[PDB]
Structure formats: structure tokens, C-alpha cells
């Protein structure tokens, strides 16, 4: 248009094979480095000096067991920059101390910021409301709390999840054994939103496909399915039914997104070990009365079994020499 | 010339003017589901502890016996019963019936019959209303998951004590014991189920945000936009081309599901197939076809075992297993 800023603005918003925009200056390099850094780590970089594990394709791992493992516990919450005082420019030592994890997590953090900015930018360019950006704040809150806020409250980056399939599976059982994360009401609200979102996806797609009108042309001014028939069906099957199409689609937004946001609030509490581990009255009752036993008390026994049997190898920086007599067993109870 | 009583009964049962449609499938659904509902409520509020293990150590599950809503459950049947049919009339006393976990068998069997009849009832109302009959196929996936978790896993393991308890903490206990014994997390079918549930939430939020974003202006300022849609209207309530252009520019030039029919088919199909596969994974793990075992997969030149993340997962499974196998 007028100035040099206007030509750059016109070039970035030009209709090409992939939209760039101003957010693409932040999204495209950060997302490419995070994904490229993750693919580099699962292929070549080991976790031998941080976890005592082999976690790369070079060492014999497959796609399920390879991971970009977290830094060593001695690193603390260091940013672990390549030029930082830990690696001092040595990229080989940087890979061995787990600096690739902070590389993927930090560039991935600015990647999801750039993607949400991209959602805002395209919505303003097309001219629609920015509800996709609000819906993406759910995954942003989950990524920020789990991969950044939770290790920042813990001892080090070591206790964050590692970028891998089986490594994430360990992180699930770690938070169950150490925090009783299933008993947290914030995770329960998260399960309700995520399972409810899958229900809403299945039930809405089936209803539209089955209340279809006998005739989708892209420029169809009329609706392709009968809302009256769909409302009549679910009112007699379930008792209640949607009657507003706009409320039905806000609800499809709200339920899974609120599940991500509610579970993220509990992870923040888990960062400071403010966990919902026990019911004190039920724990006191089982102490005085050994015959007393509920499913919650049986679960706390399994949490003790998780903690003591993994701690020797899950946290190798600490020695944790546990003899067989102190290892909890249901047999010798 | 007068109408027979059976004709009036058939006209009332299959009537579409009832507030809740009954139908012939509902003739099985309503008494079974109301039986299981009242029995579950009574057993949840007040029921003596059930000796699930079979060795005279009972587990309390009712509110009146010292547990809350989270820890409350209808404890599964005793290990002495196994997969034996245990109705209330085959027990010597009501006290012995409640001691052996009979309420679990009653509630589970009536609930299973009720949800199968619910599938049939969904088809029935779809038939009476003149619509396409595949909502029941979509509901067949959570029904399959419930069947695998309540009936089929006890069949494979040989005891209804191994079924999922009808409670929250009991559900978590079932999940932990199942992971310890079968490694469901490393099963490919549970991966397909997690992909189905995660993707279903993604696609639900995505579709909802896309429709909510492109709503056509019909209301005044700060008034609720939901009044812009009229129930029974023919015209579209949102701008489909604007949402398609946004979704196209979001990822790559032409990616929007331009045909809304296949978009909604994909929405209805993805979590249903995922839940089908995770139900079949749970059902196949009942017969000891466990998940992937990548234990001791990396060794050095001298034969020493280098652990992977699967080894740490196995250590967690072993801890849960040794705390579950009470004097094996």
C-alpha cells in the first residue's frame, strides 16, 4: 500500500499454497525446530547419561519406546541453552545432559503461541469470530501446565514428561503412584470433558447423517438435516434434546475445552504436591480398624507398590537401595 | 367390530405421541433399567461389606458403612461364586446373598439387558420417525465397552469378581489391576481407543468452534446469539463458505471438508471405531492376549541389559502386580 510495512503485510497475507501471516514468522521456525528436534532426538540422541536409558533408534529402540528424555536432575530448572554454562557450546555434551528436551519444550511453547496467533490472524483475515483460538487455549493450557508448570514446581525438569510414547505411559503411572492423580476431582472433570467431547462428536455426527434430507452442495442455503426430527428423536429416546443449532455447537466447543482447562488446574496443584492423595477420615478408620477396607484404601496400597518398585530405576540419580523386605507386597502384608 | 385389547396395546406401545417412546424394545428396557437403578441406589446407600476375595476379608462399598461418593461402590461378586449364576433365591439367606456380592450380579445383568434393549429402542424410534437407522450402531460402541468391562472380562478370567466395580475408586482399582496384569497401555487397541477419544474431543471442539465462529448476524448487541436460530427454520444458521475458507487457510490450501455429509460421517465414525477397537482390546486381553512386550529389548555387547522406558513401565506394572497378588 503506502509504506514498507504495508508491502510486507500484503506479502505475508497473500493467498499462496500455505498462509504465512505475521504469526508465521514465529510459528514456522519454532514449530519446525520443535518437530525437527524431536525427530532428531528419537533417532540419534540417547538418555544414558540422564536417565540410564536407551531411547533412540540408534540404540535399538522402536517408535513406541524411543523418546526425547528430560534433562538430568542435577540440571535443576536450567534453561540448558547450547551456549549456557552447562554445555558451553559443545553440542555433544548438550545432547548428553538432556538439552534437547528444553530445546523441544521451549520451541514447542513458542510454536503453540504462534499457532494460536495464526488462528487469530486468519480469523481476522477471513472475517469470522475467533472461537477456534479460544478452543485451542485448551491444548495450550494442557501443554503449559504439564510440560512447563509441573516440572517448575517439582525439583527439576527431570520429572516432566519425556517426549515419547512409552515415556508418556510412565508419566501416567508416575502421577498415579505418587500423586493419586485419578482421585483428583480436577482430573475427573477432565475425563468428563474429554469423554463427553468424544460422545458429542459421535452422537452429533450420527444424528446429522441419520436425520438427513432426501436430496451437500457447497452453496446450499438450506440445511441438509432435519432439526425437528432430530429433536423429536432424542426427546423420546433420552428425555431431552437440542433445539438450538447454535447452542449445540457452542456445547461441542465447551465440553472438551473445559475438560482441558479443569484438568490443567489440578496439574498446577500437583506441581506443588497439593494432591488429592487421601481421605483422612477413611485413612484414620483403617488404621484403628484393620478389618475396614474400601476400594480407595486398596488403591493407596497399589500407589505404594508403584512408588517403591519404580523409584530405583525411575529416579537413578538418587541411590534408592531398597532391600526386598522393605519392598511392599500383598503377600507379606 | 370393536378393537381388540391387543390392538390398543400395540397402538399405545408403538405410539410416537408418548413423552418417552416405549416400543417393544422398551418393554424390555424400562423394567430392567428401573430394576438395576433402584437396586444400585439401595446397594450404594446401604449394603453390608462384600467378601470379594473369598477369604473372609470383606470390602465396604456403601455410604452407611463409612465411605463417601468417591470411594463408594457396588463391590463385585465373591471369588467363591466365580461365573456361577447367583440370583437372590439361590442364596440361603439375604445376609449371605449380600455377603457374596449378589447385588453386583443383579445390577450388572439387568443393566446389560437394558442397554441392549436401548440400542434396539433407538433403532425402533428411528423407524417410527422415518429416519435412517444408524444411531444405534454408534451407540453399539459404548455398549460393547461396557460388555467387555462387565461381562466378557469376567468370562475370560473365570470370575465376576474380576469385573469392574460399580464405583469411582473401584473403576480406578480395576484400571490399575488390569494394567498390572495385561499392560493395556502398550496394547495397540487401547492406543486406537485413546486416539479415538482424543480425536473425538479434538473434532468436536474444532467443528463447534468453526460453526460458532461463522454464525450469521441475526440478533442485537450483547443479546445471546442463540436467539438468531429459529427452531424449525430452513435457512442455514452459519456461513459455511467463511468457515471452510478459514479451515483451508489454517492448515493447507484445500483441506476443508467441503461436503458436510462426509464431515459429519467422519465425526460420527472416528470415536465409534476407536471405542470399538478399545472394547475389543479389553475383551481380547481377557483371554491373555496382552499388549506389546518390549522388555529387555536393548542389550550391550557384553550382554548387560540397558533399560528403556518400557522397562520403567514394567517396573510400575510389577509393583502393582505384587501388591495385588495377595499370597499367590
Amino acid at each position: 500500500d503506502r509504506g514498507v510495512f504495508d508491502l510486507i503485510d500484503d506479502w505475508l497475507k497473500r493467498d499462496r499454497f500455505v498462509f504465512v501471516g505475521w504469526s508465521g514468522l514465529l510459528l514456522f521456525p519454532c514449530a519446525f525446530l520443535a518437530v525437527g528436534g524431536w525427530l532428531t532426538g528419537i533417532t540419534f540422541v540417547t538418555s544414558w547419561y540422564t536417565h540410564g536409558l536407551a531411547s533412540s533408534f540408534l540404540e535399538g529402540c522402536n517408535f513406541l519406546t524411543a523418546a526425547v528424555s528430560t534433562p538430568a536432575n542435577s540440571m535443576g530448572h536450567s534453561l540448558l541453552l547450547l551456549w549456557g554454562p552447562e554445555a558451553q557450546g559443545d553440542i555433544t555434551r548438550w545432547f548428553q545432559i538432556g538439552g534437547l528436551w528444553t530445546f523441544v519444550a521451549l520451541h514447542g511453547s513458542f510454536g503453540v503461541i504462534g499457532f494460536c496467533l495464526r488462528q487469530f490472524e486468519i480469523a481476522r483475515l477471513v472475517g469470522i469470530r475467533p472461537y477456534n483460538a479460544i478452543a485451542f487455549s485448551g491444548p495450550i493450557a494442557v501443554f503449559v501446565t504439564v510440560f512447563l508448570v509441573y516440572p517448575l514446581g517439582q525439583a527439576s525438569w527431570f520429572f516432566a514428561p519425556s517426549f515419547g510414547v512409552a515415556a508418556i505411559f510412565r508419566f501416567l503411572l508416575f502421577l498415579q503412584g505418587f500423586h493419586n492423580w485419578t482421585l483428583n476431582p480436577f482430573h475427573m472433570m477432565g475425563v468428563a470433558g474429554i469423554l463427553g467431547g468424544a460422545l458429542l462428536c459421535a452422537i452429533h455426527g450420527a444424528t446429522v447423517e441419520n436425520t438427513l434430507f432426501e436430496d451437500f452442495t457447497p452453496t446450499q442455503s438450506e440445511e441438509t438435516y432435519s432439526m425437528v426430527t432430530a429433536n423429536r428423536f432424542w426427546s423420546q429416546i433420552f428425555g431431552v434434546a437440542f433445539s438450538n443449532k447454535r447452542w449445540l455447537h457452542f456445547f461441542m466447543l465447551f465440553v472438551p475445552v473445559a475438560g482441558m482447562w479443569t484438568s490443567s488446574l489440578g496439574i498446577v496443584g500437583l506441581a506443588l504436591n497439593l494432591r488429592s492423595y487421601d481421605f483422612v477420615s477413611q485413612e484414620l478408620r483403617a488404621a484403628e480398624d484393620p478389618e475396614f477396607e474400601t476400594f480407595y484404601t486398596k488403591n493407596n496400597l497399589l500407589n505404594e507398590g508403584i512408588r517403591s518398585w519404580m523409584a530405583a530405576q525411575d529416579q537413578p540419580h538418587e541411590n534408592f537401595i531398597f532391600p526386598e523386605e522393605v519392598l511392599p507386597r500383598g503377600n507379606a502384608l | 367390530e370393536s378393537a381388540s385389547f391387543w390392538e390398543q396395546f400395540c397402538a399405545w406401545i408403538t405410539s410416537t405421541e408418548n413423552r418417552l417412546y416405549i416400543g417393544w424394545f422398551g418393554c424390555l428396557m424400562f423394567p430392567t433399567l428401573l430394576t438395576a437403578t433402584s437396586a444400585y441406589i439401595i446397594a450404594f446407600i446401604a449394603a453390608p461389606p462384600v467378601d470379594i476375595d473369598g477369604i473372609r476379608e470383606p470390602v465396604a462399598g456403601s455410604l452407611l458403612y463409612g465411605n463417601n461418593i468417591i470411594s463408594g461402590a457396588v463391590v463385585p461378586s465373591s471369588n467363591a461364586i466365580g461365573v456361577h449364576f447367583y440370583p437372590i433365591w439361590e442364596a440361603a439367606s439375604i445376609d449371605e446373598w449380600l455377603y457374596n456380592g449378589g447385588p453386583y450380579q443383579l445390577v450388572v445383568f439387568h443393566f446389560f439387558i437394558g442397554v441392549c434393549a436401548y440400542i434396539g429402542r433407538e433403532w425402533e424410534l428411528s423407524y417410527r420417525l422415518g429416519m435412517r437407522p444408524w444411531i444405534c450402531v454408534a451407540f453399539s460402541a459404548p455398549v460393547a465397552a461396557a460388555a467387555a468391562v462387565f461381562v466378557i472380562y469376567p468370562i475370560g478370567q473365570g470370575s465376576f469378581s474380576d469385573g469392574m466395580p460399580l464405583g469411582i475408586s473401584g473403576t480406578f482399582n480395576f484400571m490399575l489391576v488390569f494394567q498390572a496384569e495385561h499392560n493395556i497401555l502398550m496394547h495397540p487397541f487401547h492406543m486406537l481407543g485413546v486416539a479415538g477419544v482424543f480425536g473425538g474431543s479434538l473434532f468436536s471442539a474444532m467443528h463447534g468452534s468453526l460453526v460458532t465462529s461463522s454464525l450469521i448476524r441475526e440478533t442485537s448487541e450483547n443479546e445471546s446469539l442463540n436467539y438468531g436460530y429459529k427452531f424449525g427454520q430452513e435457512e442455514e444458521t452459519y456461513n459455511i463458505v467463511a468457515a471452510h475458507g478459514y479451515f483451508g487457510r489454517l492448515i493447507f490450501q484445500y483441506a476443508s471438508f467441503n461436503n458436510s455429509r462426509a464431515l459429519h460421517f467422519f465425526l460420527g465414525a472416528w470415536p465409534v471405531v476407536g471405542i470399538w477397537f478399545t472394547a475389543m482390546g479389553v475383551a481380547t486381553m481377557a483371554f491373555n492376549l496382552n499388549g506389546f512386550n518390549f522388555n529387555q529389548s536393548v542389550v550391550d555387547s557384553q550382554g548387560r541389559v540397558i533399560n528403556t522406558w518400557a522397562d520403567i513401565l514394567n517396573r510400575s506394572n510389577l509393583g502393582m502386580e505384587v501388591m495385588h497378588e495377595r499370597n499367590a
Partner: peptide
Amino acid sequence: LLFFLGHLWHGGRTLFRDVFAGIGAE
């Protein structure tokens, strides 16, 4: 964390004030 969500919501309502009652039908 909850105030990060409010920033996204109120930031979107500012930059999209003209279209927040809905968009054109064309």
C-alpha cells in the same frame, strides 16, 4: 492460568468487536 484465558477472550472481543454479533450471510 485462568487470567491467561481471560486475556485471549477479551483480546479477541476487542479486535473482533465489529463481527462479534455475527457475520454476513454472503
